[PDB]
Design a protein around this ligand. Structure first.
Ligand code: 5Q3
Length: 301
């Protein structure tokens, strides 16, 4: 197919300061930092990921490849890599972390407008990966980051091509078949994760039982806040026949119509009165805030 002319930026170790830890576990760690390029007079808030062994470096450079090859407002792009003993990825900082923990910690202020807009945004990012012929293979609320409460982006590649059993389509569990339509099943589970404010899908059920459970016809239950309209979409993502599930372009359309009148599709007690932080809030944006630019506003030719 087409030649991948994406640029892989190699960033100097001496170009980024104020390194603090955000999260550690399984693979390695994710750090908070500030990237100050050349004599650019800019400070970019960044996230530095590291999984020394040749196996860890191969897996991280595989994600670097995929992340450098993507450019969408709802996909987390690579700013560059740092060639230290262990190769570390440098991406845009999403200060609020993963959506899974966000819906859990902020449920009392999460309204229908926010939830449906999140669904539209995830579908837009997922439809972009489909245009770029990329199958995510690991879509979940834990792999969707929060830049601002009104802006979310898809993250965690490396599993992406051209195991999370409870987020997987039946063909993937049984035959290891991964398609854009299997990412649609993962999208369905992700939506369920949001509508339940971070519930564990099939909680208590061991992963070895899931395959049989799905084959019998059992699916994730209807969340209390969900109307038949929203749940019908979720159910459609969990059909045996992959070609019967909605396409991501149909999911954008469906959720957009719904996001126009959110109270008609999601029933949350004390809705609209709820408010989350915005760039219009007081002290929304620690060091010299003078020359700080977000990565979304830092473009290179
Ligand atoms: C109480 N909590 C403490 C930790 N907090 C936090 C955790 C992680 C990030 N950031 C990230 O996880 C992050 C990325 N994480 C990952 C994770 C796995 N794979 C990739 N490629 N990126 C990627 C880009 N930008 C980010 O900010 C930001 C904040 C949230 C509040």
């Amino acid at each position: 197919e087409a030649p991948n002319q994406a640029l892989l930026r190699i960033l100097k170790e001496t170009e980024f300061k104020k390194i603090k830890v955000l999260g550690s576990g399984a693979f390695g760690t994710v750090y908070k930092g500030l990237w100050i390029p050349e004599g650019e007079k800019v400070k970019i808030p960044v996230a530095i990921k590291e999984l020394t062994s040749p196996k860890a470096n191969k897996e991280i450079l595989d994600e670097a490849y995929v992340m450098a090859s993507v450019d969408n407002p709802h996909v987390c792009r690579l700013l560059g890599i740092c060639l230290t003993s262990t190769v570390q990825l440098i991406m845009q900082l999403m200060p609020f972390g993963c959506l899974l923990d966000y819906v859990r910690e902020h449920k009392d202020n999460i309204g229908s407008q926010y939830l449906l807009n999140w669904c539209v945004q995830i579908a837009k990012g997922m439809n972009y990966l489909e245009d770029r012929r990329l199958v995510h293979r690991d879509l979940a609320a834990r792999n969707v980051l929060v830049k601002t409460p009104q802006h979310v982006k898809i993250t965690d590649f490396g599993r992406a091509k051209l195991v999370p059993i409870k987020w997987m389509a039946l063909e993937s569990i049984l035959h290891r078949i991964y398609t854009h339509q299997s990412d649609v099943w993962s999208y369905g589970v992700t939506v369920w994760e949001l509508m339940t404010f971070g519930s564990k899908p099939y909680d208590g059920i061991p992963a070895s039982e899931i395959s049989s459970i799905l084959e019998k016809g059992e699916r994730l239950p209807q969340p209390p806040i969900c109307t038949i309209d929203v749940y019908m979409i979720m159910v459609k993502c969990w059909m045996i026949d992959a070609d019967s599930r909605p396409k991501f372009r149909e999911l954008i359309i469906e959720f957009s119509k719904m996001a126009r009148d959110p109270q008609r599709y999601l029933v949350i007690q004390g809705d609209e009165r709820m408010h989350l932080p915005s760039p219009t809030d007081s002290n929304f944006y620690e060091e010299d805030m003078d020359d700080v630019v977000d990565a979304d506003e830092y473009l290179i030719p």
